Design a protein around this nucleic acid. Sequence first.
DNA 1: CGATCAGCTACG
DNA 2: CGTAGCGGATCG
DNA 3: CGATCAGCTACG
DNA 4: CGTAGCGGATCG
Lengths: 372, 381, 377, 378
Amino acid sequence: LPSLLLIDEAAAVLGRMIQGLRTGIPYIHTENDSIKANPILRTALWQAAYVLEKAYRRRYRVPWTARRYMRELTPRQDGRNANREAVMAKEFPPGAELNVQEILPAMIIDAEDHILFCYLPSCVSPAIMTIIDAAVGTLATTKDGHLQKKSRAREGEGANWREALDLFRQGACKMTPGVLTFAPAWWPVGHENQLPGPASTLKPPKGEGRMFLSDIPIASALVGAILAQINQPLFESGVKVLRELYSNSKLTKDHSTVSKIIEIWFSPFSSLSLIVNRATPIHRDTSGPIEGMDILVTGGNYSNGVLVTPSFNRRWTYNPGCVVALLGKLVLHGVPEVDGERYCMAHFWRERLFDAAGVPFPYPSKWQESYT
Amino acid sequence: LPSLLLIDEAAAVLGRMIQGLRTGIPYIHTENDSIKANPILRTALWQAAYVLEKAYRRRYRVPWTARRYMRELTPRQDGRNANREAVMAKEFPPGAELNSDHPVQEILPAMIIDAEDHILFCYLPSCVSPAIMTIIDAAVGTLATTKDGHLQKKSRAREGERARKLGANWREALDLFRQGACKMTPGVLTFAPAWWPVGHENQLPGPASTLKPPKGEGRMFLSDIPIASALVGAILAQINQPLFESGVKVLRELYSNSKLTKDHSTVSKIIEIWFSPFSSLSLIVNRATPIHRDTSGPIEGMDILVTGGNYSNGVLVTPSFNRRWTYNPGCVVALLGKLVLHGVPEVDGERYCMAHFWRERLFDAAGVPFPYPSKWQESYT
Amino acid sequence: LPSLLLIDEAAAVLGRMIQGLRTGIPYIHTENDSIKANPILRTALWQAAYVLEKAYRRRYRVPWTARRYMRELTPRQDGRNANREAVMAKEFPPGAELNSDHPVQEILPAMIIDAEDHILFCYLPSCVSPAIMTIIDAAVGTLATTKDGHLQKKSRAREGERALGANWREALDLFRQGACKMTPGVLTFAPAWWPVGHENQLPGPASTLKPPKGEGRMFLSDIPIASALVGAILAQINQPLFESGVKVLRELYSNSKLTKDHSTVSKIIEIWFSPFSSLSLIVNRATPIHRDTSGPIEGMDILVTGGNYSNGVLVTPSFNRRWTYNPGCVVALLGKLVLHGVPEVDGERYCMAHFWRERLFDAAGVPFPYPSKWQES
Amino acid sequence: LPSLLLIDEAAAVLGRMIQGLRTGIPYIHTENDSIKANPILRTALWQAAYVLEKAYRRRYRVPWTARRYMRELTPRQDGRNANREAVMAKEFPPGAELNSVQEILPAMIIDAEDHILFCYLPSCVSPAIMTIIDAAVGTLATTKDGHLQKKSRAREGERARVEGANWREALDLFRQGACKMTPGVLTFAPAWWPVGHENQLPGPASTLKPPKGEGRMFLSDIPIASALVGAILAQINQPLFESGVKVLRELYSNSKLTKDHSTVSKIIEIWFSPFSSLSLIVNRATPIHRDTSGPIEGMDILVTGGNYSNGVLVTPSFNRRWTYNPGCVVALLGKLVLHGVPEVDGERYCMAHFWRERLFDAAGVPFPYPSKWQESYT
DNA sequence: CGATCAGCTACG
DNA sequence: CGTAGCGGATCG
DNA sequence: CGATCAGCTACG
DNA sequence: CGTAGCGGATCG
Ligand SMILES: O=C(O)CNC(=O)C(=O)O
Ligand SMILES: O=C(O)CNC(=O)C(=O)O
Ligand SMILES: O=C(O)CNC(=O)C(=O)O
Ligand SMILES: O=C(O)CNC(=O)C(=O)O
Ligand SMILES: [Mn+2]
Ligand SMILES: [Mn+2]
Ligand SMILES: [Mn+2]
Ligand SMILES: [Mn+2]
């Protein structure tokens, strides 16, 4: 599969670049691969390398380990319960380093050097941001696409807060607010009992979702390369899971479609969700494995984006081009209303795909693995 | 059709000659057929029989199957990526029969087979008889000494660049062509009865531009070498008989069925003077060849290279076999061009190469399945 | 657990000695581990390293892959069908390296590999140090001199009968006629095992091993260093199989919900110095040409022959070979692929066969691994 | 796959037995195979050899070729049209060897070019195997809520609700009265196209999909009988036998030719037959017909059993009636030869082994032309 | 997302 | 006469 | 459909 | 003690 080869090249090249920035000997790309043939990809990798090196040089530490924090969590603690969240705040305080709105790349590590949060502002190069803007605009401006049909279905008529109307941007939008999800292997609502299959959004071979994916393979390669810089075992394990889902047709239904989607799937993650013109309340993401690091990319036409992490006592500037990697099941996070239109791409995981593929899900990486 | 009958009979006769060499009961050509009508072809078939039997008795094996190698290759992996080639070389090494401390240049006819007895490479030095080599030399000289043929027109088309590693257009890069004193104009021409323009595999195929003038230089070169092409086709039938017969069937369907090609009477006229089971033939005059894989043909296609000219130091390099092969005039090499990395450095003189290769979409159009590579034992049946 | 620690360390040390022999920088054992605690084991490992390196330098190749050979075999093709064996011999011949110009019997260490570098057969003559051979001779003698041990009790049970095919392993045609110091017969040992036809219950301890101080448990206690040696050899030939067998034993020891009578099985494992599933002792029996069909396709079995005989031969027809099979000789082979037999010898002989049960791997949740390629050692 | 090896061994051994009967040098089975290990199979092969050798010595010839007959037939001419059948009877008469009661001796009908069109084999099946088949069919037709009883109540319900295009399940044909075995029709196949789903990829027959349903265990009860039938076919038409085996191997190997290929592979693993399909017709009379759903060149095999005394199979274009009592085997080009079986004085079942050419096309295996009888004697 | 492609005729 | 403008699924 | 199976507790 | 009767998916 050449797509997985491309994502490997992006990841490896990004690592060489970061190493060059650290040693003072600049990496010079000579190999004849996709990176030399596509300056947009090369430039985007260079920008991500700059931001990642800066973030790796600015590390805050909380006075507890992710393991104990996760053991105090209940299996579906998403942050709606104020009593238990106060319990968490007292048992796992921010610590002396964290007792201001940040703008500089940084990361939060636990007492045993595990990365819980990586803040990367302006990680995505303007070319790729333009590309993503165009793709999302095409998906959210179609007349009878999934988003418009859902948008009129909801006008005719927490708990399922991800599609609550109070959270969507009300006023002037050229992009249709809503939420869509894409994955080569997914279990539909209350179909979790069966084998996984392709997401409905991706099932038409020339539907709006498949073309949206075809519009952003280089953005997805960039996001995957960032993940590989932060957690290489997780990147490689996701790639192995994808390879196994491709090979072994007895793990999915409609495996023809799953294999095609994988062929145009330039990402090590299990799934990608697009949230258009919706505020995000403080929450924990409960649907993935404890150990999964998700990646958020925000874009649009706004100036006052903020991401709030209360258990770190921090607010982070969350403007177009900003990338955030985080343990979504551990870190409470939210994004208030912005002064304009916004979209978010959330790249995340399904542990059940991992056991099905026979690939262990790894524990979060320590930051020192960066420097080997 | 006399062309397809001629090459079919040449193939069958060559097989009988090789079998006689194997059993010790010499074949003696008795039938009153086209092979009796051309003593030159018969002599050349005997020489090919000698060299083919020798190569069939000297077989190296790599410790992997072509099928797994191809599954690891990407569809357009031509060898430009050195890191990817290092991955390939470590996952599919030459094996104990082929690794050595020092680079080995072979001189004896041989073949490389995979772990499942499929032929990947066949080395046949001095396969072509002096007579047929003389003929080919004369025909290629006629093509490359012309005053306003395709070769000089191409040399002028690049005249703006000239007076001013693979990559786009490497087959005609000026870096590779012979600088100095040449009797034959360096360049590349290609011939085919049915063919698709680059990027245009969406229409119906048509005749190659070189062959469209009914008395142009290309059709006249083609008419000059029907017995050399019969010999090349017969060799192919010895290495991969199903591919030979399937190519012949494809040609027959393209000839008969007129709704498969554009300009079909021209395609039929070319097929009538097409003494070859292959889809296409390319003539490369005075050009070195860098290490590459040919990525545009079917995975399972066996291509045939014939080299000639007046040079003494010819070498063909196969890195994934850890081998260099003496590649002097008259040498024939059959190889899975989409699997085998191969290149030819500059020689100390003038050289030309005839590359016979395939287009799977022609097989699809003709309704003929493309077969999987032959096992060597099928020769011995 | 000292059993698994001893065999793991023996395997690692043997690998280091073989590596030193290959590079020319001799391994020198400095660590304070199990190997220093047993100089006899260390000596035997050095001898095995020498013979293994010699065998690795003398490699014959068959012109086919084990995968294609096995795909043409039927799951219980033991060699009884002469037509089917002719089919196999014609479709999978010995090849040019094996058929043309060698002696009546081989005497030098060697191995047969397939077209994809997988090991099919490893001939290792004089592999066992004389000390360990003495030890095994004594333990097998102790098992075969008892009044009313299992060996004598089965010899009596064949009463009126005396006055391939089912039960060939104990056919009377094969056992030594005359006067024997050792009682001919067959015994089998395993920490977890299924009775024939009963792979539908939980596995339990081998019958021979259940008395806490019976003859079988003391034969096991007498040969821990011979078993550690055999296990280390196996790890040199197929490292994934060694480590996976060790994991299976570890799971059977830990997880008590896999076994019946799990305390007893735990004791057996504690004195089980071997990664193999099971061990069979064949005393004074010739062996007809056969394939062992009951184990996993990819399982490497190990045969050890001993006794006081001079004309021992192991016949592998599909390799066109006869191998000198005298006391101290070790043979590793894919029992499901390689036809092999041992004719009657001019004296008394015993064989220790170490082999596998794939259902054990399934029960322990450990996948059965693919055979290693020979270069990986 | 050991199943295909078993049927190959049965075919080869049967041929050796027939050769021994012809030369006068009896075959002696020495090989250590399934035939030596199973005396029931060996005895049954011996009986089939006796009857087949007798049938090959009694050959009638019609004065036309099967090819011209098929060329004059229309693609769905099943015999319902009396005008077309009168035309066929004038253009292809029985001929001087056949025009002129009920035959009882094993025989065969060949065409003007020695192709076998019909082989009559009375008491071909050994009593042991007939007992076995009786028991398996009785088990199939007595299951409490199995396919046959659910069909039969679907039939009573529709007859009651009322106050050929589906003649094979027409209610007039089934035995009315006292039956131990539930009348009906079932069909089994590893690769099959359901009604309404004939432009999809082939898949396993509905009857065989439950891994321990009544259909799969009926198949598990009669592998030795299925091996016997395949061996008979291999004696009459060896290329067809071997081509059916090749099609089965391709369907087993190539997982992209079928849906639910897991199930198809399991079924193939217990499919002891070179035929594409097997149908069981329990307690049903059979009107004169041609079978139109198979390849023109396909030779089907019928095995009849039960407890009846007056069984007859009618072939009008040969001007013949054939005694069709329990144990009788008939091989015939069902798409060419009109044939029918009247109601009998008791309970009866029929096992019909037949072909689907589309499976051969999918597997890339040509369907061969019917064998000539002389191929037996090579 | 820029590049790949064993080439060609329409047309200045 | 020469050469511009393809042409389009797919490749890393 | 009879045979295979590197064996064993339940019990006269 | 000694040994009868398993035991069941699968093999040709
Ligand atoms: O909307 C954003 O920027 C962040 N979104 C999330 O964390 C989410 O949807 O789970
Ligand atoms: O130049 C040679 O002899 C060989 N040439 C090639 O393989 C080629 O042009 O693709
Ligand atoms: O007797 C020997 O030395 C070898 N024995 C075997 O292979 C066996 O019992 O299966
Ligand atoms: O019922 C019988 O014996 C014969 N049956 C058939 O020919 C049939 O159903 O097509
Ligand atoms: Mn979230
Ligand atoms: Mn080439
Ligand atoms: Mn054995
Ligand atoms: Mn019928």
